[PDB]
Design a protein around this ligand. Structure first.
Ligand SMILES: Nc1nc2c(ncn2[C@@H]2O[C@H](COP(=O)(O)OP(=O)(O)OP(=O)(O)O)[C@@H](O)[C@H]2O)c(=O)[nH]1
Ligand SMILES: Nc1nc2c(ncn2[C@@H]2O[C@H](COP(=O)(O)OP(=O)(O)OP(=O)(O)O)[C@@H](O)[C@H]2O)c(=O)[nH]1
Ligand SMILES: Nc1nc2c(ncn2[C@@H]2O[C@H](COP(=O)(O)OP(=O)(O)O)[C@@H](O)[C@H]2O)c(=O)[nH]1
Ligand SMILES: Nc1nc2c(ncn2[C@@H]2O[C@H](COP(=O)(O)OP(=O)(O)O)[C@@H](O)[C@H]2O)c(=O)[nH]1
Ligand SMILES: [Mg+2]
Ligand SMILES: [Mg+2]
Lengths: 430, 432, 430, 432
């Protein structure tokens, strides 16, 4: 019933994937070996949403892990939690992508992509109602962009009707861990706009801000940022796993949060995010929880919503919560910040409540926002893309892997139109 | 992770290579006898065997029997497969023509035979590491042969090279301008990126930072081992945001000819001196953007950066790396090129550098290496072309090369090719 | 009641034979000495299908082992399981065949063949209802082709009505353990098409693929490939040995799987084939079991069924299995892959269920498929045959052993017609 | 398995044979005294007796008493039946006519008497193994007699021969062209396939691979024992896909005249050197398809393969054999003939090679031997015909042969027959 199949590509995807299943397995009380030891029956009632089953209680999570070099996956396999995945799911190559989109999309991803579909289809025909696919990758890299966009395009052809949501890392506004991020990112966006139903744009820089600003923990970067991301994506799919007063769904959010086909890039947020030492100095009531969702302090995207206007907003609360407070506060938010919401949409907030909270908490909520302020991000990428491309900065690496500079112009022209479309919805009615 | 082959050419390559493989044995805890004490990482540089004795996946070539003979009888005699250590009968005599036309071709095929037999015994192969010297006959003439041969049989595979670029002022030979320029003409089209290093700069750092007044090549080569170890650490040890071998060329080579990123390393501090230092992430990071810490004696402030790869190592908080890198992007003295807004490439591995027994450098908990590509290096090429023009103008040494089966026009073409390289650098230094 | 007599010829045949009886003796709980120690009574109820009996409980398997040199058979006799065969059954020569078909068919097999029939007839008149003969050999060799085809021709003359199925090794598409495989194979096919009721074409190359691809065991080649083959052939004859809801038979499959007399070369498949370490990460339900039968990953023939179309298909399930699932999945397979089945046959799947599973399992199924993709194999052999024969590559060895080059032309012309016939059934109706 | 007889002719055959039977005793653990220590395999090469002393099923013939006398007084004196060691009174003097017409026929009947009495005492008989040399009187003239005699009395039975084909450049005699060509004329129609070997090639391998600077025939003959042992291992020891004696001729002889498959073996590695090697199945397999590892100094790349038999030995995974062989079929440098798509014959036996005490070669867990038949061998025949034509053109040595009851026209026929052999090879090298 409403089965989801998980895809993770690239080094970032697998690591996020890896911490994505350590959280879910904790919610359902699933031992790393795959043996159930939970306490509440609701965990088993929908355990089939993510986990298959093998006699003896062994629950097999249907994730498909793909990367062009064995490096990262070998770490996951040797991880403490690597004993759970079906060995047949790991799809590993032997020549990783050197951050060039063409290699992971034309010459190297093409050779490995056919193998992955052979593993998706088995996990696709083993589900009685397959709701939609899930994908986690990075635009900047080569494998998360090249093959990720190649794979998302393929699964769109066979499963046009099914949902396909993407949690994707976006290049940071000012810092960069790769030099060719504009080329790779620009090509990736031109390829997602046509295939992906909903995308959750996130960036490390903004997510770094949460670590030291609202939390007080400087030591970790990748062991914990992924855990915030994992909690966020888990919140989105909670309604399909536990009972709720107002149950939501990947299709419900898409309809509510996607006015037009080409405007589907959101920016998530999560709460509560309190430090262990300051937690006892804070109330856990609904009102305060809702206040921090709409502040740029707790936005996992680099774009500040203040500069733009919200088009659609979705909240997915959790735990035993009073639905009156869940609704009075949203009416309060809309009126207080009337300039932050577009007039041509009378209502911009979607609510959903789940009875069971996340592990270690009694209250939580995942924010999903469609704001025109995200156009700044693409606008910025285009500024960087045009500057490098204006002199053919690195095109020789990309042309030499079965590609043409005409595609770059198409990717720049299509990107320019996405920015323009978001800009049209800044004006008010009439 | 997948294997990478090391090719050591000339006296510089062989002598430098021995320093490198001392580090690898220490990192993986491999005994000098070749037998590991009583895991998946060493497979990239070491080949397994039925016994416990692993074999390095490297080949040593030198036209003069003297240099390799020291290895063949040293404490690492049992580490190397006897056929890997290839030796000629006579030296190239600091002659590009000899090592490239007459005597280089007599032994070139033998080296390929061992490269193929060693390249074929790996399911995957990232590429080749090549160590040589511009200022030699074997390290410049024989190298060009391998670069050409390795470009056909194994085309479209990475070929990274660490090279001893001629020093600005000091010089251990007289024909460096002729020999150094000739190989650059041939190696420009048959290489990915060359990690230049100057002995003058390394000597300056050693006396300036390591605080030892009397260094030697046995000491410098150990420092050069660190940059190689940090560069290849991502292929052996686990760590967040690993950087593969083929990623360097994409990030640090905007154009096919502009592939000369000078090396930098930090921290280089003596054991006693380190006790008075904190070694924070920004401290080591900011230590690589000053002209007093470079392996090539060129001033970055004279030119402009156009690509930089940072390979952090040890217990590193990437958040600090992000903050430290951001600060460097907002300093007027630090100047990147106009058309490369995205000019960094970070890399982290959870493996602190190891200290060779009796070594000079300290046991740092954390380290960083930079592979910045700067247009200030065009100054070095111009100087080298200036020295070359002084000699060939009077035709002062060509008779040695002509008699070795080398046409006269090769010198003319060699300088003209380097002349275009200067203009190519000049255009990249401006904005359209 | 429905007795089967087993024939094994050549080095390959005996070794396959040898591991063929180690499996059956395990199913019926028969000690290597021939003493019964089983637990279930059904083992004895049909033990007479393969094993005769001698006072004291000694059960004698009626296999007839024939080879032109004592080498291989001496190994079987000295084997741990060699004490079971009746010493009178071993028919050994003194000058083995040098892989030349003529010697094992005209000059050397002729001298030894009369002795074998003297041993078949005794095992033939000792059976109250003899169903049919069974033969295991190799086409490439000389003894498995020369005398095997000579013997199969003889037993056709005396027992025209009785069934005669052949499990035969076919030359691999690209690798070859013998130089004269086209000559030997081509002559063998020209001689089987007229005599053998059903043939199970298998090849090492395809069977190698199972070892490392679906299983993960690189060390063995011949000790285990024969065991996969032995399990396959055991599945085919299970209905004659144990009770079943829908009992099958060698004649039932022939009728279902042989539309025309000259189209009787199938290609088997077996499931489940899981590695010991990955077995616990897999369900053993009927649906998944059926999926891998129709994929070229689990086909013991080198020919991929995708390039061609199935004419008839037979499944022989085993164990306690729900017949509804056994039937719903086949309807599912036919509709999903409607292009893989010919229209002029309304139904292409034959099912049979046995209650008792194979030793060490609770579920199993043997696939038998008649596909026109097998014509590629003969087409390939003809390409190789015509190339060598175009210049008389090795004819002097074959002519000098009582043979004529006119026979080669007949073998090539008859083979060409077999390829043509399979090609006619690629077109659709009307 | 059934018996096979060994016939050793000439100094080369007798000296080579002693090396072989040292290996057989070691493989089966037979004491040099002939008495086995206090099973079914040795019956093929050893005859049983009421006592524990087994007798080798071989015959030694030499027109010169000197060579065999060493055996008759050596540590193997009690191993051989005294009548097997047949000796003449005077040497053939490197004369084909003497060993074939005048003195060869004086002792030929005596050898047949022992062959018949030894051939009749076996229920079955695979064939004969014959060791001889083209460059001798006994090994070339007397051999041709036995090939003719053994063709009538025992026709239609295998006659395999290992022969010391004349080396390309080195030569231990002056009349090799005359003698070598004459026997080829007579042995072409009375043999199945000849396993040629050249001392020049074996010497080159010994210094190149075995890494011993000063070899001797006592050393080479031990290497030649390995190819014989591996070839005949299938007749003694159990193993999957055993290859019988008569299978070689069918696979490696497309046409009656083209039956000269040059021998190859792998691995030939010294004990100390082997510790630095892995010895994987592909490694040894790919070592046999290079012109640096051949027992006949001919370059396969010059010509084309047309048949190959691979006799693997030891603990071998046939899956790896299938994979390794497949790779060799898809290399442009490796070139098979157009009309032989199916050009391999595999063979495996579960018996690793044994090391002779004090031997040079190591104790390999696994080994392989190839019997490829290549048209590149036509070069050797053409060279031999060229040397023959130089001498007989001036009629420089015929007087020795004519005086030994040899007609003049025999030289004319001998060259014409070899001339047709060259054309026969040429046609097979192309496609119709
Ligand atoms: N860093 C470092 N540089 C070295 C070392 N040995 C030699 N060099 C450099 O090599 C340069 C000259 O080239 P060589 O390597 O000496 O000559 P070659 O490559 O052996 O070629 P030949 O002249 O034929 O011997 C000198 O200017 C040195 O700076 C060494 O051990 N470490
Ligand atoms: N491999 C090997 N070759 C040998 C050996 N002894 C002799 N030969 C070869 O035999 C060739 C000449 O033929 P011989 O065997 O010496 O002469 P022969 O067969 O005894 O005939 P006669 O001249 O009558 O003595 C030489 O060129 C040698 O290469 C040996 O012990 N091992
Ligand atoms: N959140 C998160 N992001 C990561 C992680 N590892 C890498 N990334 C991001 O992924 C990008 C690098 O992509 P990568 O996976 O290495 O490229 P590819 O695998 O070759 O396609 C960088 O911009 C990082 O910011 C991680 O563990 N967590
Ligand atoms: N499956 C299997 N095939 C074998 C075995 N032994 C040999 N073969 C095959 O049989 C062929 C050789 O036939 P062989 O029996 O030696 O020829 P013959 O006995 O002289 O007729 C080869 O192509 C092998 O692939 C075995 O143990 N198992
Ligand atoms: Mg030198
Ligand atoms: Mg002699």
């Amino acid at each position: 019933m409403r089965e989801i199949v998980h895809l993770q590509a690239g080094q970032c995807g697998n690591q996020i994937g890896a911490k994505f299943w350590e959280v879910i397995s904790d919610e359902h009380g699933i031992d790393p070996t795959g043996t159930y030891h939970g306490d509440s029956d609701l965990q088993l009632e929908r355990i089939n949403v993510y986990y298959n089953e093998a006699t003896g209680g062994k629950y097999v999570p249907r994730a498909v892990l793909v990367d062009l070099e064995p490096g990262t996956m070998d770490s996951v396999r040797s991880g403490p939690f690597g004993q759970i995945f079906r060995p047949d799911n790991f799809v590993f190559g032997q020549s990783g992508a050197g951050n060039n989109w063409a290699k992971g999309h034309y010459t190297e991803g093409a050779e490995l992509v056919d193998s992955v579909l052979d593993v998706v289809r088995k996990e696709a025909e083993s589900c009685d109602c397959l709701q939609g696919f899930q994908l986690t990758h990075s635009l900047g890299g080569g494998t998360g962009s090249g093959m990720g966009t190649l794979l998302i395009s393929k699964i769109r052809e066979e499963y046009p009707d099914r949902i396909m949501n993407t949690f994707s890392v976006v290049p940071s506004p000012k810092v960069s861990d790769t030099v060719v991020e504009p080329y790779n990112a620009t090509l990736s966006v031109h390829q997602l706009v046509e295939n992906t139903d909903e995308t959750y744009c996130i960036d490390n820089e903004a997510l770094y801000d949460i670590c030291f600003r609202t939390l007080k923990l400087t030591t970790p970067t990748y062991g914990d940022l992924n855990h915030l991301v994992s909690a966020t994506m888990s919140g989105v799919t909670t309604c399909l796993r536990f009972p709720g007063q107002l149950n939501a769904d990947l299709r419900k959010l898409a309809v509510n949060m996607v006015p037009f086909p080409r405007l589907h890039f959101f920016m998530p947020g999560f709460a509560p995010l309190t430090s262990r030492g300051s937690q006892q100095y804070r109330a856990l009531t609904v009102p305060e929880l809702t206040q921090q969702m709409f502040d740029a302090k707790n936005m996992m995207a680099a774009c500040d919503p203040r500069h733009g206007r919200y088009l659609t907003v979705a909240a997915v609360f959790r735990g035993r919560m009073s639905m009156k407070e869940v609704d009075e506060q949203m009416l309060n938010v809309q009126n207080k910040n009337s300039s932050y919401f577009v007039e041509w949409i009378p209502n911009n907030v979607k609510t959903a409540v789940c009875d069971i909270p996340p592990r270690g908490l009694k209250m939580s909520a995942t924010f999903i926002g469609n704001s025109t302020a995200i156009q700044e991000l693409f606008k910025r990428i285009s500024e960087q893309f045009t500057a490098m491309f204006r002199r053919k900065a690195f095109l020789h690496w990309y042309t030499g892997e079965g590609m043409d500079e005409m595609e770059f112009t198409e990717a720049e022209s299509n990107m320019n139109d996405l920015v323009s479309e978001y800009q049209q919805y800044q004006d008010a009615t009439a | 992770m997948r294997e990478c082959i090391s090719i050591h050419i000339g006296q510089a390559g062989v002598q430098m290579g021995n320093a490198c493989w001392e580090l690898y044995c220490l990192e993986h805890g491999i005994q000098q006898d070749g037998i590991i004490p009583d895991d998946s990482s060493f497979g990239t540089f070491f080949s397994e065997t039925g016994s416990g004795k692993h074999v390095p996946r490297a080949v040593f070539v030198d036209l003069e029997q003297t240099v390799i003979g020291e290895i063949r009888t040293g404490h690492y005699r049992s580490l190397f497969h006897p056929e890997q250590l290839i030796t000629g009968k006579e030296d190239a005599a600091n002659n590009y023509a000899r090592g490239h036309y007459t005597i280089g071709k007599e032994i070139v095929d033998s080296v390929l035979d061992r490269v193929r037999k060693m390249a074929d015994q790996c399911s995957g192969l990232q590429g080749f590491l090549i160590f040589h010297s511009f200022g030699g006959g074997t390290g410049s003439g024989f190298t060009s042969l391998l670069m050409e041969r390795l470009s056909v049989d194994y085309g479209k595979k990475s070929k990274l090279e660490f090279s001893v670029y001629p020093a600005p002022q000091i010089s251990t030979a007289v024909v460096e301008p002729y020999n150094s320029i000739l190989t650059t003409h041939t190696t420009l089209e048959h290489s990915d990126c060359a990690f230049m290093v100057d002995n003058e700069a390394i000597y300056d750092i050693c006396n300036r930072n390591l605080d030892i007044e009397r260094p030697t090549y046995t000491n410098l080569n150990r420092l050069i081992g660190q940059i190689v170890s940090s560069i290849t650490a991502s292929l052996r040890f686990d760590g967040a945001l690993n950087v593969d071998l083929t990623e360097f060329q994409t990030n640090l080579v905007p154009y096919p000819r502009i592939h000369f990123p000078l090396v930098t390393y930090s921290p280089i501090i003596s054991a006693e001196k380190a006790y008075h230092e904190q070694l924070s992430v920004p401290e080591i990071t900011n230590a690589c953007f000053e002209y007093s810490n470079q392996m090539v004696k060129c001033d970055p402030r004279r030119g402009k950066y156009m690509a930089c790869c940072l390979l952090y190592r040890g217990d590193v908080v990437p958040k600090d790396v992000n903050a430290a890198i951001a600060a460097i992007k907002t300093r007027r003295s630090i100047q990147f090129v106009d058309w490369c807004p995205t000019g960094f490439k970070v890399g982290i591995n959870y493996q602190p550098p190891t200290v060779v027994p009796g070594g000079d450098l300290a046991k740092v908990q954390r380290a960083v290496c930079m592979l910045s590509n700067t247009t200030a290096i065009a100054e070095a090429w111009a100087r080298l072309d200036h020295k070359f023009d002084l000699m060939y103008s009077k035709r002062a040494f060509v008779h040695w090369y002509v008699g070795e089966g080398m046409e006269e026009g090769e010198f003319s073409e060699a300088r003209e090719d380097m002349a275009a390289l200067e203009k190519d650098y000049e255009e990249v230094g401006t904005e359209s």
